[PDB]
Design a protein around this ligand. Structure first.
Ligand SMILES: [Mn+2]
Ligand SMILES: [Mn+2]
Lengths: 134, 134
């Protein structure tokens, strides 16, 4: 039986750029790097970067990766990414602040204020089409 | 600013099979579902499934999602997924026990024993090509 998320690994075509983006823009700590990848850490999250050169980027789908952020930091984080001219892939329309941006390989990322608890509560008050709770 | 991983969202072509796999094989608790998706939870991990029928899978790269498990549970877990005919995509060569497997849509998943510290420790003693610590 599984206990939670151990790590997340993303394929990256340009390793230096992906390190500079997650380290500098997003603030992960770089723990180690090597010719074929990097290990970085954001709080308790362990991020692997796996260098993969013919990597074309993801399928045009909704598969994506959301990081946490407290309510009072959200505005400045979004401004900071816009100031760095990071492209957005979707506009917000659900409970809680969300900023949706792309990484250097077009992986789909998200800064979100809220958690599963807050989502359910709100969904309880205003449920999605054909919604059912446990 | 960012605090960790808030949630993971996977596009899935067949919402009930995906829920059956995450809930019944992987041990995620189904917390809600609706027309276009489901919310599930594993410990502190918040997994969203986004119903997407014209989905043809993730492309053929090393992008994958590792879940934690105790040493002592790792054997029974692999045995069970294999008994159910899950497909493996990789043989474990790095530090710690790992079992690499695909979900019904072909998302690469992993059950892993260890963590970033156990790995850095191994890496100091057996460094990858070009390896550099922080
Ligand atoms: Mn999201
Ligand atoms: Mn892995």
């Amino acid at each position: 039986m599984l206990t939670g998320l151990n790590h997340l690994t993303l394929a990256v075509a340009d390793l230096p750029a992906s390190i500079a983006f997650y380290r500098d823009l997003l603030g992960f700590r770089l723990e180690a790097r090597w010719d074929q990848g990097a290990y970085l850490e954001l709080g308790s999250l362990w991020l692997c970067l796996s260098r993969e050169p013919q990597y074309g980027g993801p399928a045009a789908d909704y598969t994506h990766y959301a990081f946490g952020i407290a309510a009072a930091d959200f505005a400045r984080f979004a401004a900071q990414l816009r100031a760095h001219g990071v492209r957005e892939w979707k506009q917000n329309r659900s409970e809680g602040d969300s900023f949706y941006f792309l990484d250097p390989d077009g992986h789909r990322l998200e800064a979100h204020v809220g958690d599963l608890r807050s989502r359910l509560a709100a969904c309880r008050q205003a449920p999605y089409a054909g919604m059912r709770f446990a």
